[PDB]
Design a protein around this ligand. Sequence first.
Ligand SMILES: CC(C)(COP(=O)([O-])OP(=O)([O-])OC[C@H]1O[C@@H](n2cnc3c(N)ncnc32)[C@H](O)[C@@H]1OP(=O)([O-])[O-])[C@@H](O)C(=O)NCCC(=O)NCCSC(=O)C[C@@](C)(O)CC(=O)[O-]
Ligand SMILES: CC(=O)CC(=O)SCCNC(=O)CCNC(=O)[C@H](O)C(C)(C)COP(=O)(O)OP(=O)(O)OC[C@H]1O[C@@H](n2cnc3c(N)ncnc32)[C@H](O)[C@@H]1OP(=O)(O)O
Lengths: 387, 387
Amino acid sequence: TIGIDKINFYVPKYYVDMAKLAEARQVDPNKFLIGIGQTEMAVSPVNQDIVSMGANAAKDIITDEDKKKIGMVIVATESAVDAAKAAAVQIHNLLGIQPFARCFEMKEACYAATPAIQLAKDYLATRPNEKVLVIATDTARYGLNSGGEPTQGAGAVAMVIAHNPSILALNEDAVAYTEDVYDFWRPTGHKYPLVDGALSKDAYIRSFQQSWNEYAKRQGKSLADFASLCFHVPFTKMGKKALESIIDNADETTQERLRSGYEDAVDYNRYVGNIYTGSLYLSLISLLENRDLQAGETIGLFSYGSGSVGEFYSATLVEGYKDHLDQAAHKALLNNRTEVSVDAYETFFKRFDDVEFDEEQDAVHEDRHIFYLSNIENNVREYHRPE
Amino acid sequence: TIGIDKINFYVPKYYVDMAKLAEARQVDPNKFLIGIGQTEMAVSPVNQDIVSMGANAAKDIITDEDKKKIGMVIVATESAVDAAKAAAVQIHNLLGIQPFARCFEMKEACYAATPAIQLAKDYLATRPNEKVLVIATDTARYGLNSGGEPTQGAGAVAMVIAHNPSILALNEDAVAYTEDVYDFWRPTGHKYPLVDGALSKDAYIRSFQQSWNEYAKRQGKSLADFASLCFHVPFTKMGKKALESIIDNADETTQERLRSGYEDAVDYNRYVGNIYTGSLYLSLISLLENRDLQAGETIGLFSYGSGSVGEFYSATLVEGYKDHLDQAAHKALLNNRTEVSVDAYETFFKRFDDVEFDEEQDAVHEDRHIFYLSNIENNVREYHRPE
Ligand SMILES: CC(C)(COP(=O)([O-])OP(=O)([O-])OC[C@H]1O[C@@H](n2cnc3c(N)ncnc32)[C@H](O)[C@@H]1OP(=O)([O-])[O-])[C@@H](O)C(=O)NCCC(=O)NCCSC(=O)C[C@@](C)(O)CC(=O)[O-]
Ligand SMILES: CC(=O)CC(=O)SCCNC(=O)CCNC(=O)[C@H](O)C(C)(C)COP(=O)(O)OP(=O)(O)OC[C@H]1O[C@@H](n2cnc3c(N)ncnc32)[C@H](O)[C@@H]1OP(=O)(O)O
């Protein structure tokens, strides 16, 4: 068996209340709270870039034996800080992983972490003694008062792929679907994405339907075979709509089960926002910790990336996986964050666009036990490492 | 076995003579002709972006039947035109490849095409009826009157990976070496890379030495076991220096063989320049066509990417591979190119920086049988397709 042996996520220590943003934005809060289904939005302090966030997600799950057995570090992102250098090189360094490993990035909007773990599995096929570290790290920024602003978020998800995994076994049924469309994209030079809101909803659902249909055809399966589905989450309601568009043909028992699983799946996401490549996987953690799925049961996953590329595959829960999750820590991570006014949020957002450091505003003193961008000198990013 | 079944490259129809650039830059021509080992530099017309170049390199080697079997289209590049949408999506569209395929970019300077074909191989282990299309496409631009300018170039290399390859079988002996260093990089926003000239030379050589040494140890092999070696080529002398720093230990017969093989390997690169991710693979085509290696003989390859990541692996020639290469087309591609003065060159260059269209300067009417960027409306690139 080969699959997700360890998994974890990290989000920045700040967040803005969606009800507060709605008011500040002069809109019905329920448009956010219910309409798109988001309650709290992660706010990025300058001392947290995709590298530090990435390192932070991975630090709590990487052991010494892991550092010795990891043969590849893959970073999925659409929030790259370098046009050439893979953020995976810095993370590999910060984490102290053994030198003889491949380090690179994969890019395709919100889709990239999927081909990373899937190809990681393929790589491990004949390497039972090796492991692979996949990191999804991104900052979803649309710009103040923009259409996509309410769906913004930032964070990272780290996954350790290996043989005889403790949590999930990746099955051999993945099928991808590519369709050239301009629902969302970010031409070089643009700080923020260009987006056709309505079309992005249609593109997502179509990609999901095509992928699922072909999957169902190739594997001779139906929704009833799944304990629960897990989707890429730009905002909780997006996946809800996509799910609804196909479960009508399913039985009432199946409809109730998948509808319930979905809620557990998007529990964490509601308090973070879109984290691009990591959204699906943050949702997977939420599902694994908020639901009591039994070992042996199968989960169906749909990965999406605007542009667009979609993919559906399954994974089976390993015996005793509950003993390898960190629900308490994750609950704490979200709860122990500090709320910031819409005003402060906008200040943070502006400073971030220019990487304007400020140990006081970012409250750098509090981050003694984590990785953070401490400074940029001579176009080189420097990082503080967990004391 | 699994490996490179088909391989081809494309470079733009323009080039500037290096002796000329030397005069213009008020330097001794030999500094470029001999010093760095470059004779003709590829010049990018605006109507050729990484997408059109990529498609052009691939169009000649994929049959209608292949479009049905290709399961993944991976593009390696550090010259992306979108921070989110993978160029692999547009190419997949332009080539008419079947819809159920993964499309994405891999990024890590000039190293990226290597993990792409290597993981392409692992992916095919389970799918004997599928193929994988890997495309290295880049525009090495340092800036007029810059240190790196003499090593500039542009082009793309397409490789079809499949079972029972017609040209080269990729062996299972690859070993990568990562080391966080700032020899070359390009922070988001910078049109041109930042580079530590000298340091980049030491970084390249160190990565090759550390990669080879470990490879030799793990495989219990030595330079004498190789018919020839192939290296990433920023400029022909760079590989020469790297090879020389390691062959001293070898016997006279091995040194003579590998020195000759190297010259055949860099024959084409001398008239094109650095094409980043595609350099090593353009060199592989040069070696395959200019040398007369026999079936069963083994080639040693070193892939490098500033940042840095290095990898050494081997490949074994397949009987009859010569009949699967397009030496004529290639020889013609380089020779049938049109020359341009250092003046025309600099105008082309400045126009490229802002994608300033001009069907007269770019002589678009001559490109009826190829793909090319014909316009950009509403931030969306449009392309002309082979008549
Ligand atoms: C998300 C949109 C489209 C929203 O755009 P919007 O105009 O701000 O909000 P809306 O007008 O479209 O409607 C919001 C929802 O709330 C409801 N509503 C209305 N008023 C109220 C009220 N008072 N109380 C309760 N409910 C209310 C309303 O009915 C609607 O529900 P729906 O009709 O869809 O069922 C926009 O912000 C946007 O473009 N966001 C970003 C795009 C995006 O996330 N796309 C989703 C799929 S594409 C994807 O996931 C890929 C992506 C985005 O990650 C890119 C990548 O891969 O990198
Ligand atoms: C870039 C990537 O893709 C990643 C990599 O491969 S990293 C390794 C390669 N690095 C690069 O390609 C970086 C880009 N290029 C550069 O930084 C620079 O242009 C360069 C380092 C390639 C050359 O720098 P330069 O200062 O312009 O020329 P310089 O270093 O002074 O010398 C050029 C060579 O010609 C020789 N030379 C000088 N004048 C000469 C003349 N008139 N006749 C003949 N030879 C001459 C020099 O001796 C030197 O050779 P050696 O190093 O073997 O002695």
